[PDB]
A paper describes a structure:
Anelloviruses are nonpathogenic viruses that comprise a major portion of the human virome. Our determination of the LY1 structure demonstrates that ORF1 encodes the capsid protein and that anelloviruses evolved a novel spike domain that extends around the 5-fold axis to form a crown structure. The particle, formed by 60 jelly roll domain-containing ANV capsid proteins, forms an icosahedral particle core from which spike domains extend to form a salient part of the particle surface. The base of the spike domain, the P1 subdomain, shares some sequence conservation between ANV strains while a hypervariable region, forming the P2 subdomain, is at the spike domain apex.
Our initial efforts to study the structure of an ANV particle, derived from a Betatorquevirus isolate called LY1, were performed with the full-length ORF1 (residues 1–672) expressed in insect cells (Sf9) using a baculovirus system (pFastbac, Thermo Fischer) encoding a codon-optimized ORF1 construct. However, full-length ORF1 particles lacked the structural homogeneity and symmetry expected of viral particles. Initial expression of the ORF1 protein in insect cells (Sf9) suggested a proteolytically susceptible region of ORF1 that resulted in the removal of the C-terminus. To prevent potential proteolysis from occurring in the ARM by trypsin-like proteases, we designed the LY1 ΔARM construct wherein residues 2–45 are deleted. However, we continued to observe a smaller ORF1 band accumulating below the 62 kDa marker during purification, confirming the proteolysis was not limited to the ARM region. To identify the region of proteolysis, we generated polyclonal antibodies to peptides from the jelly roll domain at the extreme N-terminus (residues 46–58) and the C-terminal domain at the C-terminus (residues 635–672) of the LY1 ΔARM construct and confirmed the presence of the N-terminal peptide of the LY1 ΔARM fragment and the absence of the C-terminal peptide by western blot analysis. EM analysis of the LY1 ΔARM fragment showed that the particles formed were more homogeneous and symmetric in morphology relative to the particles formed by full-length ORF1. With the C-terminus of the ORF1 polypeptide removed, the protein spontaneously formed symmetric 60-mer particles, as determined by cryogenic electron microscopy (cryo-EM). We determined the cryo-EM structure of the virus-like particles formed by the insect cell-derived ΔARM fragment to 3.9 Å resolution from 6271 particles and of the mammalian cell-derived LY1 ΔC-Term ORF1 particle using cryo-EM to 2.69 Å resolution from 22,743 particles. Despite being generated in two different cell lines and the presence of the ARM region in the mammalian virus-like particle (which is not visible in the density, suggesting flexibility) the two protomer structures are very similar (1.179 Å root mean square deviation when aligned over residues 48–562).
Residue numbers in the entry:
A (entry chain b): 169 to 504
B (entry chain 0), C (entry chain J): 55 to 544
The structure:
Amino acid sequence: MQPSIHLMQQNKLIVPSKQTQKRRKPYIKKHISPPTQMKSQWYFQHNIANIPLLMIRTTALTLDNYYIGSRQLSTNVTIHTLNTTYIQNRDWGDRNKTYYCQTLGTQRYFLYGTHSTAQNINDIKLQELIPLTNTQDYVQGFDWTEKDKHNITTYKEFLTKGAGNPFHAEWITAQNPVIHTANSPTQIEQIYTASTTTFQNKKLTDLPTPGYIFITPTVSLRYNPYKDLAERNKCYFVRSKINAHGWDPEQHQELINSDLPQWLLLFGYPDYIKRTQNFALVDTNYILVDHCPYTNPEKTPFIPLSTSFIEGRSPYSPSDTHEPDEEDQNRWYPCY
Amino acid sequence: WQPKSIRKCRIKGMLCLFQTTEDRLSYNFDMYEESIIPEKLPGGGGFSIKNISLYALYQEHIHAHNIFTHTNTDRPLARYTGCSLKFYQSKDIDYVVTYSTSLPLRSSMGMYNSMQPSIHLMQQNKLIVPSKQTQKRRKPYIKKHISPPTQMKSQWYFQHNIANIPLLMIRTTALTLDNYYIGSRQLSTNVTIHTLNTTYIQNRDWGDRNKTYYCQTLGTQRYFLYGTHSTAQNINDIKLQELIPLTNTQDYVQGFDWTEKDKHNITTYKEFLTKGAGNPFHAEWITAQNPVIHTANSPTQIEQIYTASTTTFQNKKLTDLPTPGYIFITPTVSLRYNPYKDLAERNKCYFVRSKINAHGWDPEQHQELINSDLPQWLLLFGYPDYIKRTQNFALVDTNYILVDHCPYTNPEKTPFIPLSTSFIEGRSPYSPSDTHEPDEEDQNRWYPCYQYQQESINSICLSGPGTPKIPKGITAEAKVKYSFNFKWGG
Amino acid sequence: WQPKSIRKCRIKGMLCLFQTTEDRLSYNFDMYEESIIPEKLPGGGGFSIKNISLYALYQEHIHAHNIFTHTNTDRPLARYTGCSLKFYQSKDIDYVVTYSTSLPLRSSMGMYNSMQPSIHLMQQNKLIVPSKQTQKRRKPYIKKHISPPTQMKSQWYFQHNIANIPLLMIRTTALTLDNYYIGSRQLSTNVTIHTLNTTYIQNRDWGDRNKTYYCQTLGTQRYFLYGTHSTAQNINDIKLQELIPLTNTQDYVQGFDWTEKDKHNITTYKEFLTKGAGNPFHAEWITAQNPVIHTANSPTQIEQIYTASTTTFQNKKLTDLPTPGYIFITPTVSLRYNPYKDLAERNKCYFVRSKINAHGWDPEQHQELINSDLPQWLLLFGYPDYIKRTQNFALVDTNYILVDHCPYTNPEKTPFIPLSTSFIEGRSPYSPSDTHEPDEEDQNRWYPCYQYQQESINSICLSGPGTPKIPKGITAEAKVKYSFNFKWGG
């Protein structure tokens, strides 16, 4: 149905716009025969009521700006994506359950935001970090120094109230430094239950497991349809409401596409899935994924992210509403 | 002796000829669509060279831009009959086309020079495509039948035997029949060209933290440029503490005075030269907005002086340097040029390496890569892209730079040397006004180099007749529909 | 621009298409006439692939099978016009023909599969030649004119420049339009196939006097087959002295009991295994006419036992071996198969090396040499000869063996493994009944190998539709007269 492949289809009909071309009569008229199965005999009411008589396929295009619009700075489209090398947990949307980016073996890993001005990773103080500990909540978090502001008496209240959104505008893009580690905040729980005021001498390296890496949640890929083909690229849906890792299909192997380049391959695929499979919620229940080796920055599996979600704004609100709307305050997680 | 089974087969698809813009007016498109163009950087080209081959058509079908009327599977025999081209009218730009079917179909230096639109119209057997704005036709396309190449006879051939042989070569470029000799807001034809001041900037070795930059070397003595904030017009009273030497390139750093010693943790003047170094090409020094003094100082002399005593500079004057000569010399000058006042009695252009510690602007690479007998606005057109496609130099964009000789400017220097306005005003290329500083990527490449010639040589081309002066920030498309007739067999 | 002197020249001669027989029904003839076929061994083939070239015609003239109307001496220029073929009717067999003149004329795996007569008739642009018995025509030959290859134009060429280029490719096979789905004495369609019992015979390393043969190796334990003459059905009371181990292959030896110690000058049980070894594939053990017991004995255990004491075996029982398990396992089983009950939902066939000490019947040589989606009676047809001509393996006949997978037999084993009736009944191939023992030459090759698959895979092909079931011991000829038109020049 994508227009550029649609024109190649035989027995087509183009309708030039009045701006593109001025015709003598502003309409194209044709006679269409009945379906070849339906003979020219008589039938009852409510016996041919639901039988289709004519099926119309239409799409929009522009014969003038075929390969490029006008203000289009370039063809060179930027695609935001989840950093799938470290964000592998598909279970979001729970106040009670903390969010771990990935689980290697039986150890969970977490992302921590900090405001440290020192580039060293070992001197960053444990008080300054702002753990995620949740999703679905567009909350930016705050430092341990803000203990008095939110009526905090213990670090448990800090994690319940001072939790920050990993996907928040100040952390999704890594505008502020964010550190991935194997901290397992239960370790900090034990440390401050032993003594919470002793954190003045607690350093980032004192955690039982080493590894403190600046890992951004999302990266901006650069892509180009003229440089992209279809030697192996593929796309499909995966559930977003399960506590399982990996981005492989587990739902329906009949709902995998492949042998077209990305700009064609994506076209109409979500709506097709909506109409054919009738999944639980489609929009809210799960998410779409693809595999494309033809981007400048490439990750075996990919994962779109609208610019609105990356810049911290509700969808389809261009610039005026800089914060997520009232309705989506309880759904701000990677979702269709 | 026709084969047993034949099947008529057509190939129908839309081919995007070029997407051009003001900042990308005179570059070859078809070598840029294969390569990824970074976002927020205008690309494309105002002219394209097409070598349509059967393997190229199959590759296009892989990208899903065309269809086959009948598949060629298990029919190795092939037979070519001819092609039909439908040139669609662009909405707001004008393009002319021409096609050839000779034996070699090898692009040459003369062909790319002749690709410039005003000389392209003079070429015989042309075809103009008026834009819808320029003229409203009955049918918004020009259709013609093109015979196969005259060498390729009408016999049968194998698959992957005529795969790479060209069947049709298309030459296209953009123009504007209305604003032929001038755009509209074009204040005048009177184009300004920034150039390196080649009378004193003669060293071609940039891009080294360790090695200082000397503008020129006469005999065995090196000369250096120093920036100062002195408010006195006298050249002898300017204090030695106030000067800000260059001592480096490739670093967009503006420098600071000796009075700022405490700010950057400076204990010796060596730390001053390592940290307080300034870019000679910086926006506050390239244009000579602030005074800059050329001399034969040889900063090792100042090294000796302050190793003797650094605090004694309160009584050290500019004239105390062992070698005299302190001249206000701007790094770059703005020439005024006019294509109607310029001819081709001796002008010439060529490339020279930018990564060697040698002086002079003469060619030393390839005497076969010199052009001459056309005026500048024609002579430059497509010349860089020609060099990219033909010679395959090391990096082209980064390895070296282009130079010309033109006696027809108001201010004239035997050899010249473009400089895009972006590089002169201290901004990354193709960023119009918002990003006033060089980007993150080019912080380690801010030296005179081909990635900073772009807009200047493009404007030199643009000043010539027939250039499509479109509004800034808009992109113009040009689509062509191709129908190749084939007959698979076997 | 015709040459100065031309001379019309024809080439007339008789070409023997194939001489087939029941035991040689589905092999390519034209690769066997070049090689010497030993006397008293039927040869030929039921189908032939012909690549008639000018050099081939000259070679035929060297053998004096044709004539030239006019000599080509001192006339290097050549011109081809066309060929006329006269297909003579065979006396008592039916053959169909087809011809192609494409560019490559390279035989493929699909072509040789499609060569089987019942699928060959379905091919378009065919030609049937009824036998004189089947039908009496007015003129006992079919004559047609065949155009030159469509790539070869009607221009002039040099000698030894078109010498090796094919001019005409002939595909032929034998059939019988009368007995299409069944012969005559054919008791039934219900063909019996002997096969190696692959559930326990899994070792592919045969043909070594020094190395003993183990049927299979589970983990690190080897299993062996033992023949005995015990008249008691109990498996635990069978005495250890009565067993006759294999301990070798490639030797058609039946073995003997420990009681025959004196006959062969045996002093120790090592001499018993060196001399009293028996062939597991021998006529009295392959079919399990005499009981044979599979076990995990590992004869080194018996070595230890008799080195401790050899005369104490009077009290040694079969159960005293360190590892239990004594199963009556026949080396080969007779499957029943039917082409009308067999399809192609998953069946497959391929070759595997027979001269390696490795287990399993999976392919490890070439995944490009697997066939599948045809029923067995088609799938096997011409496949060995195709492999001979295309891959040029080490020895084909002796180096390795063929295997298939077919779930459609009454008794079914994931992988299968033909075995000609001759090898199962202990006789040399192609010797019907007179020579009851393997010949002198094959005394040192009597192991499962391609030289013993012949009649079985041939019978599998024969069971299919359209096979010319001729009487045993008769040979059928098929002669074709070819007339090539040429024009020498110079």
